[model samples]
Each structure stands twice: as C-alpha cells, then as structure tokens.
Target: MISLIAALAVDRVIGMENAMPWNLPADLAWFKRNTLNKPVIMGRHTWESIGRPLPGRKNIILSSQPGTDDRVTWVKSVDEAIAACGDVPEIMVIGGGRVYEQFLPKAQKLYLTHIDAEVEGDTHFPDYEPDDWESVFSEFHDADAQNSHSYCFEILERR
Candidate 1:
C-alpha cells in the first residue's frame, strides 16, 4: 500500500520559504516512530531540505533532472519511484507540496498530524472530502516544551 505521512496546520500549511515552518520535536519524533525502516518517496525539494538520505529507510526521490546520488535512488516520475521500491510492502509518499498533490489520489492510507495553529506558509496540502475517509486512529496532545501548538495525530483509510 502507498501512504502519505504529514503534519500540517489548520490552513493545510506544510512549508514556507522551502523549509518547515516550525520546530516541534514531539511531532517530529512521532514521524520518526512511524517511518523508521519504511521506504519514503519524496520530491526533489523534500530531499534537498533533509540534505541526506535518511538512515534505516530506503530513500526514493522523484526528480526530472538527470543525476544520481549513491545514497538515494532518483527517479524521473512517480511511477518510476514506485517501481524502484521493488516489492516493498508499503511505501510512504512523503511530500514537498506538489508531490503530495500528485500522490494524493493514489494513496490508500494517510497518517496526519493536525497542529492547532494557522501559520504562514508558501506550500499547502491538497484539499479533499472528509466523508471519503474512515478514521482508523486518532490521538490528541497538548502543547508542551517540545511542541509549539496542541496537535492531533490521525490515521485515515479511504472509505
């Protein structure tokens, strides 16, 4: 199955100036917990932001440019990215806005963190109907020293 994992604002904001807008270690840790050992497919911008292949996971990057990185498998499109995974049971479609929009339709599952704040950002997640999803899991957390805003983690599957 293909999945999308993200933490975004009420405004669906995910990035600004080509980088993450906040530093919430709690949510970041949650992301790490869910994604460790799982392959992640992302766009060029997402790869550039991290600046290195993540440890303990396969790194598949979607790019149109002609290049290669020994630590990362670069593909020219989404289909190629999926094909590169080579029978991985599940792949996480991590994002940089545009990539998420393209993969949204193909994704069967989503792991989302909704932060309770509206922040400025140049990149946003795509919109879809709530009725089309079945919430499989959800948990809320109050803001603490490690988080700037209260957040809720939700697992959704297409209905």
Candidate 2:
C-alpha cells in the first residue's frame, strides 16, 4: 500500500518558500511513530530542509536534477522512487509539492493534519476529488493558551 502524509494550513498550504509553514511537536512525534521503518519518499527540497535522513526509515528523494548522497537514493521520478521501494508492505509519500502530486494517484491511504488557521504560502496541496476518498477517522486538537496551534487529524482511505 502507498500512504501520503502532510500537514496543511486552513488555506491548505503545505509550506512557505520550501519550509513547513508551522511546527507541531505532537504531530511530528505521531509522524515518526507511524512511518518508522517504512519506505518514505520526498522531493529534493524536503530532503534538504530535513538536513539528515530520518532514522529507522529508508529515505528516497525525488529530483529530476541529480545529486550525490549515500544516505538517499536520488531518483529522477516518482516511478523510480516507487520502484526503489520494491515489495515493501507499505510506502509513504512524504512531500515537497511536486513529489506529492506524482504519488497522490497511487496512494491508498492518507494521514492529513489540517491546521485550524490560515497562512500565506507559496506551496499548496494538490487538488483532488474529495468524493473519491472516504474519511474513516478524525480528531481535533486545540491550541494552548500560548497561541500555539489547533489542528485536526484526518485519516482517509480510497473510495
């Protein structure tokens, strides 16, 4: 199975100028717990922003532009990324925009963090038919007194 994961603002913005627009430790922990040991794929910029490879998972970066990295298999296309994953029981499509778009069609499950607020961003989630996905679960988290952040965890499956 292929899984897609991302956090988006109210405007469905994934990031601002190559960086995630917001941070949530809870969400980060959740992400790590769930994707551990899974094959995760992302675009070059996402890999760059991460600095180092995430431990306990096989990391693959998608880029038509090539670069050398022993820790990552830099592939030129999403198909190549998927191919590198081989027969892994599950593949995780982690993002940076273009990579998400390429893998969205094949994703069987989606773990989405929907922030309760909006922000200006140059990057956005890809458009898709909501009717094609069934929301199997959802949970809301309220921001603390420090103006932290509020978010919703939505689990969706292909219809």
Candidate 3:
C-alpha cells in the first residue's frame, strides 16, 4: 500500500520558501507516530527542506541531483523509490508540491491535517476528487499551548 501525508491550510497551502508555514507540534508528533519504522519516499526539494534523513525510517529521495548519504537511498523517479522499499507493506510519500502531485493518484491512503487558517505559501497540495476517497477517520483539534492552529487530522482511503 502507498500513503501520502501532509499538513495544509484551507487554501491547500503547505509550504513557504521550503519550510512549512506553521509549526504544529501535535501534527508533527502525529506524523512521527504513523511513519515511524516505515519507508518514506520524498522528492529532492522535500529532502533538502528537511536537510537530513529522518531517524527511525528508511528515507528514499527521488532526484536527479548528485549526492550520496549512508542514511538515504537516492532514486531518479517514483517507481524507483517505490521499488527501493522492497517488501515493505506501505511506503509513505512525504512531499513538496511536485512529489505530492506525482503520488497522489497512486496513494491508497491520505493522512492529512487540515488547518483552519490560510497562510501565504509558494507551494500547494494537489487537489483530488472527493468521490474517489472515503474518510475512514477524523478528529478535530483546537489551537492550544503546543499546537499553533486548530486542525483536523483526517485519514482517507481510496474507494
């Protein structure tokens, strides 16, 4: 199975200048909880945005750029990245815009956090048909001491 994960605002804005527009600790923790010990595939820009391999997961980077790291497996395309996962049951597609767009159709599940406020951003999450997916779970969270903005963590499975 393949899953895509991202946090976006109402307007689908996800990042600004290679960094996420908001700092939501709860959402970060939620991401870690779901993706830990799994294989994660991301595009070059997303890898650069993170600056290093994420610990506790096998990080696969898709890029034509030249670089090497013991912590990451570099691939030139989405198919190569997915194949790099070997027998892993689920590969998490973490992203910048282009990466998300590439895998959104192939993703079997979407782990999304919908933020209440719209923020300025250079990148946006790709749009999908609502009828193509069914929400399996959803939980609302309010802005609090640790979370910067109110958001809903929703999980959708392809139908």
Candidate 4:
C-alpha cells in the first residue's frame, strides 16, 4: 500500500516558511506512530526540512539533482521511489506540497491530521475529490499544553 501522511490546517495550509506552522506534539506523535518502521518517500525539499533520515525507516528521496548521502537513497521520480520499496507492504509518502500532489492520485490511503484552525502558510495540501474517498477511521483530540492545536486524525481510503 502507498500511503500519504500529513498534517494540514482547516484551510488546507500545510507549511509556513519551510516547516509546519504549529508544533503540536500529539500530531507529531501520531505521525511517528504510523510511519515508524516503514519505508518513507519524500521530495528533496521535504528531506531537507527534516534535516536527517528519520530513524527506523528507510528514507527515500525523489530528486534528480546531483547529490550523495549515506543516510538516504535518492531517486529521480515518484515511480522510482515506489519501485525501490520493493515488497514492503506500505510505503509512507511524507511531504512538501509538490510531492503530495504527485503521489495523491496513486496513493491507496491518506493519514491526515486536520488542525481546527485556519493558518496562513506558503504551501498547501493538494486538492482531492472527497467523493472518491471514504473516511475509514477518525479520532478527535482536544488541545492541551503539549499539543497546541485541537485536531482530528482521519484515515481516508478509496471508496
């Protein structure tokens, strides 16, 4: 299965400057829980934003630009990243906007943390047809001292 994992505001904003606008610990924990020990695909910019390969998962980068790094396997395209995952049951496509846009059509599932607020941001989640997907699971969480945003985590699968 190819899955997309992201946290976005109600307004569809996904990023500010180069990082997520809010530091919601619970949301981050949710992301880590789902993606850990899996193959993770991301664009070059997303990889740069993360700074390093996340431990316990294979860090696959889609980039044609020349570079060499022992921490990640660089591929030229999304197809290459998927192919590289081989027999792994699911590969998580963690993103910056362009990567999510490219992978959205092909992904089997979306793991999204929908923040309750409308935040101003430079990058946004790609548009998708809600009719094509169904929410298979959902969990709502209220804001707390550690998690600044009240949010819901939803799993959407093709209907």
State the C-alpha lDDT per candidate: 0.89, 0.85, 0.91, 0.90
CA shift at 137, candidate 3, in angstroms? 0.2
Cα lDDT of model 3 by residue, 1-159, tens digit: 999999989789999999997889899999999999999999888888999889999999988876567579999888888899999888999997999999998999999999987789999999888899999999999999887789999999999
Candidate 2, 1-159: lDDT as tens digits? 999999888767888876877778878877897799998998888998888899999999887887668887778876788899889999998897777887889999999988876788888888867988999999988987543799888889999
What are the TM-scores, per candidate, against the unseen true structure?
0.96, 0.94, 0.97, 0.97
CA RMSD of each candidate after superposition: 1.0, 1.5, 0.9, 0.9
- Comparison by TM-score, 1 against 4, better one: 4
Give the clashing residue pairs of candidate 1, or none: none
Residue 55, model 3: lDDT of 96
Task: Give one clash count per candidate, in the order shown.
Answer: 0, 0, 0, 0
Candidate 1, residues 1-159, lDDT tens digits: the string is 899999898789999887888888888888888888889999999999888888888999988997568788889988998998888788998897999999888999999999998889999988867888999999999998768799999999999
Candidates ranked, most accurate by lDDT first: 3, 4, 1, 2
Candidate 2 wrongly placed segments (more than 4 Å): 145-147
lDDT of 4 by residue, 1-159 (tens): 899999989779998888887888888889999999999998888888888879999999988886569778889987888998889989999998999999999998999999987778999998989998999999999998888779999999988
What lDDT, from 0 to 1, does candidate 4 have? 0.90
Range of the 10 consecutive residues with the lowest summed lDDT in candidate 1: 66-75
TM-score of 1: 0.96
Better of 2 and 4 by lDDT: 4
Largest lDDT belongs to which candidate?
3
User: Residue 57 of candidate 4: its Cα lDDT?
Assistant: 92
